[PDB]
Amino acid sequence: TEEEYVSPRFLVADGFLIDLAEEKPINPKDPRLLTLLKDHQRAMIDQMNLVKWNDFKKYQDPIPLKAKTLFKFCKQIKKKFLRGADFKLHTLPMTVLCSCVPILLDDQTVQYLYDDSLEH
Amino acid sequence: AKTLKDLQGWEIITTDEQGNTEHYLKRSSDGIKLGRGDSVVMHNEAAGTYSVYMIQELRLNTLNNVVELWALTYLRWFEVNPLAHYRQFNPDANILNRPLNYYNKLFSETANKNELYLTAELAELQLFNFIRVANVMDGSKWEVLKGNVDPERDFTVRYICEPTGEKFVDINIEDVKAYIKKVEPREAQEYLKDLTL
């Protein structure tokens, strides 16, 4: 994984396309990008490795990420998760108030990304 | 091929001192007021992020309560031409060795992401896209405000420029606000557009 500013607004880091104007990750398949970006820019994104947001539908718990850049530029909120014995965080229903990044999938289910370099 | 929709929650107010020609919209619930010279944070579907404007005029109809909200468009940091900015504000601008991505990064990581840029381009606004009132201020006031900045509503403006993000010209946003709510729409818009020609 490598970092790079595809434009002043869009930054590609840690496998995600980061919309700096919104301070959050954006699906690399959002049609808006067809107009918001010029071909050479969208080509730069093709040549790079980006997480396919659909691979996320399959998971129920928030995902721990090793991405100093993503958490540096993305808004975060407080969310409550269960602290399991596998030392990971899980959906609620040993509680932890953890800050993380929310990303809206097509499945409409929200997936949560939290900083894995942190001990709670 | 047109329909009349009711501006839910809003109410037009006519005055000079008060009365039942000056105009300004007022929202029933909280009572916020919008008129010439006020800046607002608006939802921008196409852009996928908000845009900020300065209300330029409230065109009303003498017959029916039809309102048209018009305003000057601000540019946010990411709409500034990165190479133009570097060439006009950087001390050793003659050297542009690096690839475009480098200037994108430099600008993005050193710019005040809450500093807006005035432009003379008018746009008609639809109230349902209204998010909240924007606080657009002068650098002096912006300095006193640090440590208590609400990035959702607090902005600072020191230049006006072309919609493309070039030709930066100094302005006293307070003097502009004062001016805009003084003269007549067409006049102000004509003048604002000739500062970067």
Nearest by CB to residue A5, choosing from B46, B49, B101, is: B101
Residue A107 forms contact with B (CB below 8 Å):
no
Residue B82 forms contact with A (CB below 8 Å):
yes
- Quote the CA–CA distance of B82 and B108 in Å, as a whole number: 9
Q: Which residues have C-beta within 8 Å of that of residue A91, sequence separation ≥ 6?
A: A60, A61, A62, A81, A82
Looking at CATH, the fold of the domain delimited by B4-197 is given as SH3 type barrels. (2.30.30)
Tokens of residue A78, six digits: 């407080």
Among candidates B151, B162, B141, B157, which has minimal Cα distance to B54? B157
A30 to chain B: nearest residue by CA?
A: B48
Q: Which residue has the tokens 């939802």?
A: B43
Element (H, E) at A81: strand A77-83
Alpha helices in A23-117 (DSSP H): 32-36, 39-46, 68-73
Q: Which residues have C-beta within 8 Å of that of residue B168, sequence separation ≥ 6?
A: B85, B88, B89, B117, B159, B160, B161
Residue B78 forms contact with A (CB below 8 Å):
yes
**Which amino acid type is present at position A63?**
I
DSSP chain B: -------TTEEEEEESS----EEEEEETTT--EE-TT-EEEE--TTTTS-EEEEEEEEEE-SSS--EEEEEEEEE-GGGS-HHHHHHHH-TTTT---S-HHHHHHHHHHHS-TTEEEEEEEEEEE-GGGEEEEEEEE-HHHHHHHTTS--TTTEEEEEEEEETTTEEEEE--HHHHHHHHTTS-HHHHHHHHHGGG-
Tokens of residue B163, six digits: 């919609």
Bridge pairing between strands A63-65 and A110-115: parallel
Q: How far does A69 lie from chain B, in Å, by closest CA?
A: 13
Tokens of residue A90, six digits: 């899980």
Main-chain phi, psi angles of A41, to 5 degrees: -75, -45
Tokens of residue A66, six digits: 């090793």
Could you say which DSSP state residue A101 is in? E
User: For chain A, how long is the longest CA-to-CA vector?
Assistant: 49
Burial class (CB in 10 A: 0-12, 13-18, 19+), A22: middle
Residue A47 forms contact with B (CB below 8 Å):
no
Q: What experiment produced this structure?
A: X-ray
- Quote the CA–CA distance of B163 and B180 in Å, as a whole number: 19
- Quote the CA–CA distance of B25 and B7 in Å, as a whole number: 10
The DSSP bridge partners found for residue B23 are B14
Tokens of residue B61, six digits: 């109809």
